[PDB]
Structure formats: C-alpha cells, structure tokens
C-alpha cells in the first residue's frame, strides 16, 4: 500500500497504470476495500443478459486470498497483473484455484459443476439454442475428456500447454490493457 511497493516489482503495472486503477477502484469503494456484495454489482453490469452473481461469488473467493472477507487493493492489483499481464505459469495456477473451491487442490467434476453452470447461467435464457438442462454437463464431460487421463495440478498445467489453441486465448488481453 505505497504505490512504489506495488510498482514494477513483480507487479506488471506501471506508475501511471497504478494511478489509473486506484482512481477507478476507490471511485466505487472509497474505503479502499471492496466486499463480495459490491464485487457482484460491477460484474453484473458488464453482462446484463443474465446474472453474474453466481460466477462472481467464485471469482471473489479466488481474489480473496486467505478468506479474509474483503479483498484489498494491494492484492486486488496483483490478481489483475497475474491474470492480465502475468506469465503462462501464474495464470494457470490462478485459474486452477478458481475451480478448486475447497482447500486441497483437486477437481472431481462436482466442484467445477457450478463453475461451468455459472458461465452458462450468466447468459440468461435468450440464446439461439435455447440452452438445455444438461448442456453444462456436456461441456464438463468433453472438458474432462482432454485432460483427465485416469481420474490434478500437474495434469492441468501439461494439458493446457499441450494444446496451443487455449494458449493463444489466455494471452488475449495482455496486449490491450
């Protein structure tokens, strides 16, 4: 919480970029900390077709390390820096912990059952295929078909790196902000 401490010191934001983020961050939450209730208000504005509160709840937990209850600006930026301008390795662990709802690191097709459901839920019911009750399960089933060899963290890292198509999608937003 200095401005120079979170400078280009394992934080991928410059001094001017840090100033812009804090002006926007404190604009919505003047107290300097944003909580889960407010964390869903901004996210739901970007996706008005459905409700993003279900996905924001899992997103907030990933941002809120140590389950403090409120996510501060110091560790809010380092989450943005890892996700936006971070390296390959840091992005995958952050996403792995986003799917890993519980404490220990494992994915068992029930923990991320809600994750894919939240992605489909936040589109509302207005799409061309009119969706389906079992369409989130099909997306999970095909997702496990490419990494789940037998029944982990090491598997997730090697599977994403094996397919270059997901590789070029992770680095989508580093060039523009």
């Amino acid at each position: 919480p200095e401005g120079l401490e979170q400078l280009e010191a394992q934080t991928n934001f410059t001094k001017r970029e840090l100033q812009v983020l804090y002006r926007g961050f404190k604009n919505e939450c003047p107290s300097g900390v944003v909580n889960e209730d407010t964390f869903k208000q901004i996210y739901a504005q970007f996706f008005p077709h459905g409700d993003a509160s279900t996905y924001a709840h899992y997103l907030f937990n990933a941002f809120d390390t140590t389950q403090t209850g409120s996510v501060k600006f110091e560790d809010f930026v380092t989450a943005l820096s890892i996700l936006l301008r971070g390296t390959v390795h840091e992005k995958l662990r952050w996403t792995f912990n986003l799917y890993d709802i519980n404490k220990d690191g494992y994915i068992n097709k029930e923990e991320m059952m809600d994750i894919v459901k939240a992605i489909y839920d936040m589109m509302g019911k207005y799409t061309y295929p009119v969706l389906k009750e079992d369409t989130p399960r099909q997306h999970v089933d095909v997702f496990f078909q490419k990494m789940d060899k037998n029944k982990t963290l090491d598997e997730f890292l090697e599977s994403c790196q094996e397919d270059d198509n997901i590789m070029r999608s992770l680095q989508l937003f580093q060039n523009v902000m």
Partner: protein, 460 residues
Amino acid sequence: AAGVAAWLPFARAAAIGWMPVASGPMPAPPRQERDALIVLNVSGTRFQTWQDTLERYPDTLLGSSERDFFYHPETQQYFFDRDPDIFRHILNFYRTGKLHYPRHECISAYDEELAFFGLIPEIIGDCCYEEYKDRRRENAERLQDDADTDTAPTMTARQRVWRAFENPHTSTMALVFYYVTGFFIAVSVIANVVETVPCGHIKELPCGERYAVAFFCLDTACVMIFTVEYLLRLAAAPSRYRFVRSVMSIIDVVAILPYYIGLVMTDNEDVSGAFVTLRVFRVFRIFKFSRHSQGLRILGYTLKSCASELGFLLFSLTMAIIIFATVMFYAEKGSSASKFTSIPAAFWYTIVTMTTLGYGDMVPKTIAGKIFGSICSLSGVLVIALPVPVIVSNFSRIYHQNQRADKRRAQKKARLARIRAAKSGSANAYMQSKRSSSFETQHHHLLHCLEKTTNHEFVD
C-alpha cells in the same frame, strides 16, 4: 500529539528546565533533515496548504503515502476528482481538528467524501454533531423504508394464501374474504345491539327472552367463522408461535373465547356472575377492524409510541384527582344535604369537573368549595391539555410518513424498471452491433468472448 505540531519548539524550550535538575546522558537528538505549500486541485478548484498541515494526521488519505496515487506529476500538483465545495471542509479538519457539517449539503454526498479521504463521522466537532446525526437519521430511515422487502408460488399453498391474508387488496379471493369478514363482524355487533334493545303485555320484554333463538344461531355462526378464519391464518403463518404472540392474534383469541367460555360454563350449572362479564367481552370483536382500517393501526402505533406520555397523564390525573377530592370533601362535608360523603364519593365529582363535563348532580354549596371547584376545573384543563398535542402530533407524523412510504415504494418500482430498461437497452445495443463508441467496442468484445466460450449466440 501530532495535532499540535507547530508547538514543538515550545515543548523543546520547556525541556530546558529539566537540564539543571538532570544527569546528562547525551539523549541523542534525532538530527532531522531540516516547506513550500502544495496544491490540492480537486477538479478545477486548486487548494493550497502546507505539507506539514496534512502530515499532522497520518492516518487519512491526505496525510499518508496514499495521496501519491493522486499525484499528477507533470503539473506538480495533486488532482482529485471529488466535490470542490465539500473538500473545503476536509482541509479545515487538518488545521483545527474538528469537522464542520454543511447544512446545505446532502448527507449522502458528505459521507461519501469522508469515506473517500479517510475521515470518520466520529471526529466531527460538537458544534454541528446533533444536526449531523439528525440528518443521518432521516437518510437511514429512507434506506429502511425503501428496503422493507414488500415484494409479493414455488412451494405449497401456505405462502400463496398468506400473501392474500396479509394483503387483501390483491387477487379476487382475498378481497371477497376481507369483505365477508367485515360484513360478519358488522352484522354480529349490530345484532348484539338489537338484542340489547327492547323489541316489544306482562312486561316490556327485551329482544333476548321471546326472541334470541335465532340470535344465538347468528352469534355461533359468527364465532365459527372467526375460528375457521383464525385456523386458516394459523395454517399459513411461518411464525406460527410468534404470530400467535402477535397483538392481532391475541385480539382474535380474546374475541373468540367468550362463546366457548359461556358454552363450557352453561354445560355444568349456570350462574349470572360471569354472564354480564362475557356479554361485555363479546363486543371485543370491534377491535378486529384493525386489519380492515389503517386508521386503527396508526392509532395503536401512536399510542404505543408515546407510552411514557400516557403514563405521566395518568399519574398527574390521579394526583390532581386525589388532591382536589380531598379538598372538596373536607370543604363541603358539613352541608345539610351533601353528596360528598367521602373522598371516593368526591372522585366522581372531581373527574367530572376536571374534564369540563359537568352533570349538576353534585355541586358545591359553600363559598370555600366553589373556589376550589373552579380551580379544579382549571387544573383539569391544564393537566389534560399537556399530553393531548403530543398524541395528535405523533399520530399526524405517523400517518404522513405512512402516506409517504407509499410513494417511496412507488419510486422503487420505477427505479427497477429503469434498471431493467438499461439492461434491455445494453443487450439490444450488442445485437445492433452484431447485425452491422469507445468503451462500447471493448464491452461488446467481452460478450463476444462469452458467446464463443459456450458456442452459443445471443438472439433477440
């Protein structure tokens, strides 16, 4: 403390007196470094204060390393995008130490600047803190009224019949139930009035001896309707025990008890001791109109709110009654034909005179008694006139705020409609871009990414 920081040379000069009576240990002076005023441009209006002025409170935004986020370097000034006429009171805090509340500024924006700059409402000066809380109370009450959760069938019939019971103005069955309950209460009390009055010989027999064979049927039908509607209310109350503990259920129980109590009493033996008491209690179904009429609820609320004032009314009334009854009894006792036999006998005269009612059955017949009777009348006027305005004032305030609150709910529904309209417009704007601004281009790309991560497309 750090607030009085310009007086450090004064304190250091005071420490010189310790040296003659001291044992010099070479206390190692800190040997500090060595003051130009800085600019605080809050959206156009530049504010200039010395840096030492801000640093004397190193736990807020202005005095901290936090303001380095708002430093705009090429102009060598701190640029904040906040209110220019509210940051004026922020700077005054760093000089004196007490915040001042602007009587002309909205309190929802004043609190926004206090939270932004790190100040707290606990440090505002005592000069304006009473009004700050008063204006904070009105804003707080506005939030509570607007967030009362008045929204009104995924589960069993209990909720969808309780919503009709609680709100009889909706649907079509709720209104019918409301009307039939009101009609039954009215006909019950009217019929009671009829059998109390004589209708017709051996004697002027009332309507309760030759008649009242069908009046009993009407009374038992009304009691049965009351009991069954109470049971239906019980079958839809999530707070069944608490709902029973509520005042409305207590009134319903009091209304329905007398018929069953009388039936039990007449099942075994029969006496007239509790007959008149039960007949008196039978009229308590009049208070069941509280649900039907909002006026009764408002009256109950205003009586419960100023309960202390009614207690003082009763205490002062009893005090004056006792004093004046004693005076009149001891002043109008030796008369030839006097009805002031005792202080309790003078209680009736005292309460008649105090309320400016007047009957003439008991009148003073002595020069001493008439003066104290007039003084009793004036003192009764004075005593009763004190708590009357406060009851009426509270009643009017409650009725106006419960007349208000209705428009508060109306603006909430319109506000949600505007939010939904914006959501529909934002969704429609994306489709128009798909068929064929600065931020809108990037925002639609996020939706485009969401489309192609689930291989689905938004359509109209």
